Design a protein around this ligand. Structure first.
Ligand SMILES: CC(=O)N[C@H]1[C@H]([C@H](O)[C@H](O)CO)O[C@@](O[C@H](CO)[C@@H](O)[C@@H]2O[C@@](O[C@@H]3[C@@H](O)[C@H](O)O[C@H](CO)[C@@H]3O)(C(=O)O)C[C@H](O)[C@H]2NC(C)=O)(C(=O)O)C[C@@H]1O
Ligand SMILES: CC(=O)N[C@H]1[C@H]([C@H](O)[C@H](O)CO)O[C@@](O[C@H](CO)[C@@H](O)[C@@H]2O[C@@](O[C@@H]3[C@@H](O)[C@H](O)O[C@H](CO)[C@@H]3O)(C(=O)O)C[C@H](O)[C@H]2NC(C)=O)(C(=O)O)C[C@@H]1O
Lengths: 114, 115, 114, 114, 114
């Protein structure tokens, strides 16, 4: 598996606009909401769950990176795998998107798979 | 269990106004106090205690997050489960509320579960 | 045991003014010095030692929190247990106080046991 | 093995211009892009991958240090070992360079093996 | 053993001017260079190696503290134990000094053993 798999979706020139931390089924988790830096379009919501999905090993690193980018408000590319979370109220509140990557973005390109 | 279970209480548009760190019964713990950003209502107090309650696994992540939201002073939704801490002096000083989640807020919403 | 036990001692309206990190007997440790925000009184010194005393489990969290308040320079209440550390040169250099808690203080009250 | 082995390569007076965090084959990883402080030259890309390659033990420290240097934008020397990552799409997106060290380049020169 | 043993050396009113992070023999390490706040005398170079020396258990705490002091630029007392590291290229690049402690300094005295 890889962040950059073409079966994963990504969204460039985004800003992390919201951050949530909580717990589900004995596992800490977090979610982020991202929006286009220019405000156009629909927000992306994605979550990471410490002990769930093939992406569990990256939980700490993505949490830290989300916090960092959230603190700077800089443009990023967000990478997700769709249809991963399955608890219905959790998906309703957030989404089924698993967060699988974050890339810094310049004016012209983003530093990550495309 | 889940932060967003409807058996948990939550309070929107709060600012973390105080922070305490200590130890009880072999466990490091932290407590926070929050007040409505607009001045209304009653302060909320909640604590997380390492290795204690069903919420133990999120202690570290919640501590870090509390420290962050505290440092920025931004508006948040605080999620608690009531009547969890039972040590009477501790409860009297702080509360029985376990801290089970923290959500950033916008002008119209907070990014987390609600009823 | 609890930070708020009345057999512990606390001091309000203080600022963490100094910070030291080292090692003793295979254990990392840190110490802090606090002084009254208003310049009155006598400094408080306390240490925490990674694998020593009943307070060992809180070492990391106390260190992080000491660092936090030290960086903000805000008014705090420091909670100690007296006469814990016993290595004479160590005590001479710092004190026998074990650091057992830290509370933020507003102008008229502190958020912690009293 | 050592960061300073002459079989490794390094580049001085660089600035970390981009940062990416992801996961590949069960491992969180990060990549950085660096460019000359004065704008010349060709970018340098390097990655560190958790629990992969002989440089795995330093993953956390290198991640933290990359973040630090990325946040300040200060001049640095980046140390790599070439031809370590083999996953082809990953290499095409980033590079095969393992990140093996980071040095500040402040006053006299770069503070690290040369 | 202790940071404050009289068989250790220390240097007061030093500013951390350089920072390096890398790996040697499967072990992360960092090194710092410090100079007198008034720019007199000779720089001090000291390293900490995870998994090596008796000071190994304090590695993370020292790295963290070095980073902090390095970012503030404040004057500190550096505690070292001499003649510890043995790999000649390493010693030649850096020094044989093991970092054993870091103390904040007021205008008149440092908060550490002397
Ligand atoms: C180990 C111990 O004895 N801890 C005490 C601690 C200690 O006496 C001093 O902090 C050491 O300097 O004091 C604690 O209570 C203080 C007393 O100073 C607070 O009530 C604090 O008091 C202030 O006004 C005081 C008077 O109350 C006192 O009688 O006289 C002094 C002058 O010598 C002051 O005028 C003060 O110190 O400014 C008012 C201030 O608002 C009070 N702080 C708070 C948070 O309410 C303490 O440090 O909390 C009690 C502790 O058990
Ligand atoms: C993998 C590899 O080749 N690593 C080299 C590295 C590399 O060639 C370049 O960094 C790629 O851009 O270069 C290293 O050595 C550099 C040379 O650039 C230092 O000597 C650096 O050189 C400066 O002046 C140089 C000349 O010395 C050189 O011959 O030609 C260039 C022309 O562009 C410059 O005029 C410079 O680049 O500014 C002087 C500067 O002070 C030097 N920096 C330091 C820290 O000494 C390197 O990047 O360290 C060597 C490495 O092995």
């Amino acid at each position: 598996e890889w962040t950059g798999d073409n079966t994963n979706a990504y969204y460039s020139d985004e800003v992390i606009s919201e951050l949530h931390v909580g717990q589900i089924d004995t596992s800490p988790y977090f979610c982020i909401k991202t929006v286009k830096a220019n405000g156009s379009g629909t927000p992306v919501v994605a979550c990471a769950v410490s002990k769930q999905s093939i992406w569990a090993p990256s939980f700490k690193e993505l949490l830290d990176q989300a916090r960092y980018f959230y603190s700077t408000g800089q443009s990023v590319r967000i990478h997700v795998q769709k249809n991963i979370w399955t608890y219905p109220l959790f998906v309703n509140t957030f989404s089924a998107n698993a967060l699988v990557g974050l890339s810094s973005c310049s004016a012209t390109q983003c530093f990550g798979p495309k």
